C-alpha cells in the first residue's frame, strides 16, 4: 500500500474536550475523571501578560469565576489548584467518557497526535513531532490553547502535550499534563529564544526505510559508511548524531527490508551531499523527520 | 499560526466501524441504523477474483454466512442485498451511536478524511483528495477494505468513500456509499488503466494563498497574467484548467490576503516554469494540490 502522515483516531479524546472561560478569556480544557486541566494563562488579562504574578492572580479569582461547559453540559467547580503552568479545576460531575489514560512526558523526536479545538469543540487532528528545540510546528489559531497531544497504544490514551502559546517565531510551545514546559519556555509574553533545530536522523532513516517497503528504491546506493563518519556528515548538515540505540531500534526495519542500517546511512550521506537532483521519496522533495521507527512499522505492517 | 494536513475528528465514525467476515474473508463494514455496508468482494474466494459472477455467489451465501461483530458486540443478519458493488446486511440491533449522516458522491478535486481500520478497529486518520483519475493515494494494507472517507460539516457526517482495492499501480480505488466506483474501475482482479493525473490547479492556488496568510510570501511576483494564457502554461505542465468558478471560490481568499487571483496565477506560472530554485512553501519543495479552498479557510480562520 502507501505511506501518509496518519493521526491516531480522535474519539476517546473528543469526549474529554470541554470549554473553559475565566473572566473574558476562553480556551479548551481536558476533563478526565473529576478534574479539568487547562493552561494557567487563562487567568491573565491583557495587561498582566508581560510578566504576570500567577499566584497573586489566582488568589483574586474565585471558584465561581471558573466556568466549565462540556458542550451544552454545565460543569461546576469545587476546587482549584496550580500545578506548574496548568490549573486543575476540580468539578462535581465526573466524565462518563473518561478513557484509560496516562500522563507521559515525551522525549525529543517522539511523535504524537494533536486534536485542535476551539471553544471546546474539536476541529481537526494531525500528527506532530516533538523537536530538539522542544517546539512543535502545528496549526493553532486564537483559542486553540488547551488542545492536547496524545498517543493511543492498545486501549490507553497517553496524553503528552497541552498547547499554550505561539512564539514570535511562528512555532508552538506547551507543556506536559503536569504543567512543565517542554524546553526553556515560560508562559510570559516575552521574546523567547528557541535554539537550533536538529533533524531527527533516526526518523529520516525510518522514513527512507518506509520508502523501500512502499516501492521507492532509487536512493539505495551500493555503498556503505561508518557510524563515526556518517556523523561527521550529520553534524555538517545539522543532523542529530546517530547512536547504536538508534541502529538497534531500526533492527526490525533492517530485517524486513534486508537493507543494513549502515547501508541506509550511506544512502542518506549522498542525499545530504548531492541533494535529490529532482526526484522524490514517498511524494516529497524534502527529507522527512516526523516519522519515528514505530510510526513506520505501525503503518507498514 | 500554521498550516498542516488536518483530518476531521474521527469519533463519530469509529463507533460505526464493525467487523465483517464471510467465509474466510474479513473486512471492515459501516453500521448505520440497522444496515451494515461493506464491499461486495467479501463474498469472493481466491479462485473467483479474476471475474466473479457476484449474483451467483450471493445466491450461494447465506444470512448465517454473514458474520458481523461490533467489537465484542455480536450482530445478527436478517437480510442481504447488492447495491452495485456494496452489500447491505440488514441486522436486528440498530446502532446507538449512529450519527446524523448523509451519503454524498464527491467531485474530482474534493478532499475528505479516511479512517483506516483493520478487523473493525480504527487505526488512524488522514486527509485524502479525490483526483481527476478518480483514484486516491492512501495507506491501505490487507484488510483495510471497507474503511470509509468522510467530511463533517456542522454536526453531520457526509460519507463519500468506501475503499475496495489497490491497483497494480499502487494507488487506491473505491466507491461511494451507493456502491458505484469513482472512475472506470471494477471489482475484478484485472489490470485496469488509470488515466493521466492532472494537478488540481484551484487547490494549488489555495495552498499558496494559505502560505501568504502563514508568512510565506517569496513566490509573490510583481507580475500578472491572463486566464487564457495561464491555462496555456497549465496544459503544458498537466494542470487542470482554471475557470471563473475557480476564480470565484478563491474570492474570500483573494480578499483577506488582498492578492488578486490572477496575480497568484502569475506567481504559479513562474513556479511551474522556473521551479522553486531551492526554496519551500509551507514546508514543502513540491506544489500541493490536496487542500481545497474550503480546507484553507477552515484552517486559516
Ligand atoms: C490560546 N487559547 C491563546 N493564548 N494566548 C496567550 C495568552 C497568554 C500567554 C502568556 F504569555 F501569558 F503565556 C500566551 C498566549 C492568546 O493571547 N490568544 C489570543 C486571544 C485573542 C482574542 C481575540 C483576538 C485575538 N486574540 C489565544 O488565543
Ligand atoms: C481489503 N480488505 C482487501 N481486498 N482484497 C481484494 C479482494 C478482491 C478484489 C476484487 F478483485 F474482487 F475486486 C480486490 C481486492 C484483497 O485481496 N486483500 C488481501 C487479503 C490477504 C490475506 C492474507 C494475505 C494477503 N492478503 C485485502 O486485504
**Contact (Cβ atoms closer than 8 angstroms) between residue A197 and residue A289:** no
Cα dihedral A257/A261/A267/A271 (nearest 10): 110
Label residues A85-105 b or e (16+ Cβ within 10 Å = b): bbbebbbeeebeeebebeebe
- Residue B123's SS3 state is strand
Q: CA end-to-end span of chain A, whole Å? A: 10
How far, in Å, is the centroid of ligand 2 from the Cα of B178? 20
**Contact (Cβ atoms closer than 8 angstroms) between residue A270 and residue A221:** yes
Strands A101-103 and A156-166: parallel
Strands A17-22 and B73-75: unpaired
Cell readout for B167 is: 491497483
Q: Which residues pair with A32 in a beta bridge?
A: A35
Q: Exposure of B98 by Cβ count < 10 A (0-12 exposed, 13-18 middle, 19+ buried)?
A: middle
**Contact (Cβ atoms closer than 8 angstroms) between residue B173 and residue B193:** no
Euclidean distance between CA atoms A300 and A210, whole angstroms:
7
Tell which residue, B136, B139, B143, B99, has the closest CA to residue B121. Answer: B143
Packing angle, helices A261-274 and A201-213, rounded to 10: 100
Active site residue A41: yes
> For residue B42, what are the CA distances in angstroms to A86, A166, B27, B47, B55?
50, 49, 7, 13, 13
Residues from chain B contacting residue A300 (CB–CB below 8 Å) = 141
**Contact (Cβ atoms closer than 8 angstroms) between residue A202 and residue A268:** no
Euclidean distance between CA atoms A212 and A193, whole angstroms:
38
Euclidean distance between CA atoms A26 and A120, whole angstroms:
9
B5 and A126 in contact by Cβ < 8 A? yes
Euclidean distance between CA atoms A209 and A203, whole angstroms:
10
Euclidean distance between CA atoms B181 and A214, whole angstroms:
25
Active site residue A64: no
Euclidean distance between CA atoms A164 and B1, whole angstroms:
12
**Contact (Cβ atoms closer than 8 angstroms) between residue B182 and residue B175:** yes
Residues from chain B contacting residue A11 (CB–CB below 8 Å) = 9-12, 14-15
Euclidean distance between CA atoms B9 and A125, whole angstroms:
6
**Contact (Cβ atoms closer than 8 angstroms) between residue A281 and residue A216:** yes
Packing angle, helices B261-274 and B227-236, rounded to 10: 30
Phi then psi for residue A284, to 5 deg, are -135, 145
Experimental technique behind these coordinates: X-ray
**Contact (Cβ atoms closer than 8 angstroms) between residue A7 and residue A14:** no
Euclidean distance between CA atoms B17 and B36, whole angstroms:
9
- Order the strands of the B82-83 sheet from edge to edge: B73-75, B66-70, B17-22, B25-32, B35-39, B86-90, B82-83
Chain B residue with CA closest to A15: the answer is B11
Euclidean distance between CA atoms A32 and A20, whole angstroms:
14
Cell readout for A103 is: 500522563
Label residues B9-45 b or e (16+ Cβ within 10 Å = b): bbbbbbbbbbbbbbeebbbbbbbbebbbbbbbbbbbe
Q: Which residues pair with B29 in a beta bridge?
A: B18
**Contact (Cβ atoms closer than 8 angstroms) between residue A81 and residue A117:** no
Q: CA end-to-end span of chain B, whole Å? A: 10
Cα dihedral B28/B153/B127/B26 (nearest 10): 0
Residues 6+ apart with CB under 8 A from A143: A26, A27, A28, A118, A119
Query: Angle CA(A268)–CA(A274)–CA(A278) in degrees, nearest 5?
Result: 100
Tell which residue, A40, A47, A127, A33, has the closest CA to residue A83. Answer: A40
Q: Which residue among A11, A128, A215 sits closest to B14, beta carbon to beta carbon?
A: A11
How far, in Å, is the centroid of ligand 1 from the Cα of B47? 62
Query: Resolution of the experimental model in angstroms, please?
Result: 2.5
- Residue B11's SS3 state is helix
Euclidean distance between CA atoms A282 and B222, whole angstroms:
34
Amino acid at each position: 500500500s502507501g505511506f501518509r502522515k496518519m493521526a491516531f483516531p480522535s474519539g476517546k479524546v473528543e469526549g474529554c474536550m470541554v470549554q473553559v472561560t475565566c473572566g473574558t478569556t476562553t480556551l479548551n480544557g481536558l476533563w478526565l475523571d473529576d478534574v479539568v486541566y487547562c493552561p494557567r494563562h487563562v487567568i491573565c488579562t491583557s495587561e498582566d501578560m508581560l510578566n504576570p504574578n500567577y499566584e497573586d492572580l489566582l488568589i483574586r479569582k474565585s471558584n465561581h469565576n471558573f466556568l466549565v461547559q462540556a458542550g451544552n453540559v454545565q460543569l461546576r467547580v469545587i476546587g482549584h489548584s496550580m500545578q506548574n503552568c496548568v490549573l486543575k479545576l476540580k468539578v462535581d460531575t465526573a466524565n462518563p467518557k473518561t478513557p484509560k489514560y496516562k500522563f507521559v512526558r515525551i522525549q525529543p523526536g517522539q511523535t504524537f497526535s494533536v486534536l485542535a479545538c476551539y471553544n471546546g469543540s474539536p476541529s481537526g487532528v494531525y500528527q506532530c513531532a516533538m523537536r530538539h528545540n522542544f517546539t512543535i510546528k502545528g496549526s493553532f489559531l486564537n483559542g486553540s490553547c488547551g488542545s492536547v497531544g496524545f498517543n493511543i497504544d492498545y486501549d490507553c490514551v497517553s496524553f503528552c502535550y497541552m498547547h499554550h502559546m505561539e512564539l514570535p517565531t511562528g512555532v508552538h510551545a506547551g507543556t506536559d499534563l503536569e504543567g512543565n514546559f517542554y524546553g526553556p519556555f515560560v508562559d510570559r509574553q516575552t521574546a523567547q529564544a528557541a535554539g537550533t533545530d536538529t533533524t531527527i536522523t533516526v526518523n529520516v532513516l525510518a522514513w527512507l526505510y518506509a520508502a523501500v517497503i512502499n516501492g521507492d528504491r532509487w536512493f539505495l546506493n551500493r555503498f556503505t559508511t561508518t557510524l563515526n563518519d556518517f556523523n561527521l556528515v550529520a553534524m555538517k548538515y545539522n543532523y542529530e548524531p546517530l547512536t547504536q540505540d538508534h541502529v538497534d531500534i531500526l533492527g526490525p526495519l533492517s530485517a524486513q527490508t534486508g537493507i543494513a542500517v549502515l547501508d541506509m546511512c550511506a544512502s542518506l550521506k549522498e542525499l545530504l551531499q548531492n541533494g535529490m537532483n529532482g526526484r522524490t521519496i514517498l511524494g516529497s522533495a524534502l527529507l522527512e523527520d516526523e516519522f519515528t521507527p514505530f510510526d513506520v512499522v505501525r503503518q507498514c505492517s
